């Protein structure tokens, strides 16, 4: 079982990478299973645009960690980010600006749901999947 967790936006990185006030501290996230372009490479920033609107204009920000290992060896939280209730992750994956990442030590809770989502962006030829 996961939970959500408030958190606040101080900074929106790129597509995949956010940085948040959470637990009274600040701290980057980088997104679960989910690779974004980096911004220098193909819908780079379409995938930062996307996200930076997101966590911008919501009212409410929050994180949920999964079950598997919480940061990655650069420091960043390993987690799912939710706008206004809505999961950044599978929304970036759904419009084609993402693709579904490898499974990174047992953090898999939301891999079938985000496949799915991006099975139907490739269907569409959507973005990343034209």
Do not use: C
């Not at 996961?2 to 996230?29: C, N, R, S, W």
């Not at 372009?37 to 009212?59: D, I, L, Q, R, W």
């Not at 994180?63 to 940061?71: A, L, M, P, S, W």
Request: hydrophobic residues 35%; glycine residues 6%.
């Amino acid at each position: 079982k996961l939970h959500k967790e408030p958190a606040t936006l101080i900074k929106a990185i790129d597509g995949d990478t956010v940085k948040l006030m959470y637990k009274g501290q600040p701290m980057t996230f980088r997104k679960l299973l989910v690779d974004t372009p980096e911004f220098n490479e193909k819908y780079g920033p379409e995938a930062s645009a996307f996200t930076k609107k997101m966590v911008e204009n919501a009212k409410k920000i929050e994180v949920e960690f999964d079950k598997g290992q919480r940061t990655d060896k650069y420091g960043r939280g390993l987690a799912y980010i939710y706008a206004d209730g809505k999961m950044v992750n599978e929304a970036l994956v759904r419009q084609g600006l993402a693709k579904v990442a490898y499974v990174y030590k047992g953090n898999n809770t939301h891999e079938q749901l985000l496949r799915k989502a991006e099975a139907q962006a490739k269907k569409e030829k959507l973005n990343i999947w034209s």
